[PDB]
């Protein structure tokens, strides 16, 4: 309460540009803070390039709370969202 259950989720199945940039940002800030990486580095050292790889290999364990104007919200895991951008 309030929320919205996983079944009946009416919002966009695709990730917004604003969602992507906010996710890539937070993960880059996480990596820079010496946080554990969830993908085998390919001679990478930049926190954004690594976060970008983590999103590409769908292993970013962050969640997005989409707020509807009534106050209600829909929780979407980065793992389920589509990146057609």
């Amino acid at each position: 309460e309030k929320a919205i259950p996983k079944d009946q989720r009416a919002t966009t199945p695709y990730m917004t540009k604003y969602e992507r940039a906010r996710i890539l940002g937070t993960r880059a800030l996480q990596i820079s803070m010496n946080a554990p990486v969830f993908v085998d580095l390919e001679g990478e050292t930049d926190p954004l390039r690594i976060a970008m790889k983590e999103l590409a290999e769908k292993k970013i364990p962050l969640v997005i709370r989409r707020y509807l104007p009534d106050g209600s919200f829909e929780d979407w895991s980065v793992e389920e969202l589509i990146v057609d951008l």
Binding site: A10, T16, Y18, E19
Partner: protein, 168 residues
């Protein structure tokens, strides 16, 4: 006829024409059923607003109306075979291309549309020169133009400099 619409269909066709190396001498492998039903099916998987209720269903139905008009007229059974000379493989690729390209064309929630609108009007308004006009050939063409006129509109001017009434 020419209006700003999402998805450049012409571009997709030319892309299918080269990709699949279309031959204008050999007859196509398509069916009358394939074209008619295919274009009808493409007009279903198009999304702006999802939903399963009539309110949002009709709302989304209304949003695609003009784009579907373009789609119907461009992807017609005669044109698909006579003009474009599309193959089955090349046809399905066009169908799946539009569907995806359309979804990409949809505005993203969060987009600061208000600020964008204000700036979009503001910039060219600043670039307006000659508060008079360039209609100064005949003396009967004397109406408040440019920046003064834009000021009357936004202010909601009770009394305007050139109040006119054009009758048919």
């Amino acid at each position: 006829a020419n209006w700003p619409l999402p998805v450049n269909i012409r571009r997709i066709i030319q892309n299918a024409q080269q990709t699949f190396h279309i031959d204008h001498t050999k007859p196509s492998d398509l069916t009358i059923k394939d074209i008619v039903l295919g274009v009808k099916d493409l007009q279903e998987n198009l999304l702006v607003l999802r939903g399963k209720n009539e309110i949002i269903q009709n709302a989304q139905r209304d949003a695609v109306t003009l784009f579907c008009c373009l789609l119907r007229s461009r992807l017609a059974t005669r044109r698909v075979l006579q003009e474009y000379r599309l193959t089955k493989q090349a046809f399905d690729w066009v169908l799946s291309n539009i569907e995806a390209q359309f979804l990409r064309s949809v505005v993203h929630p969060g987009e600061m549309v208000g600020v964008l609108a204000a700036q979009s009007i503001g910039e060219p308004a600043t670039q307006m020169t000659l508060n008079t006009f360039h209609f100064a050939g005949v003396a009967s063409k004397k109406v408040t133009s440019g920046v003064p006129r834009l000021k009357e509109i936004l202010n909601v001017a009770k009394n305007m400099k050139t109040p006119s009434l054009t009758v048919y």
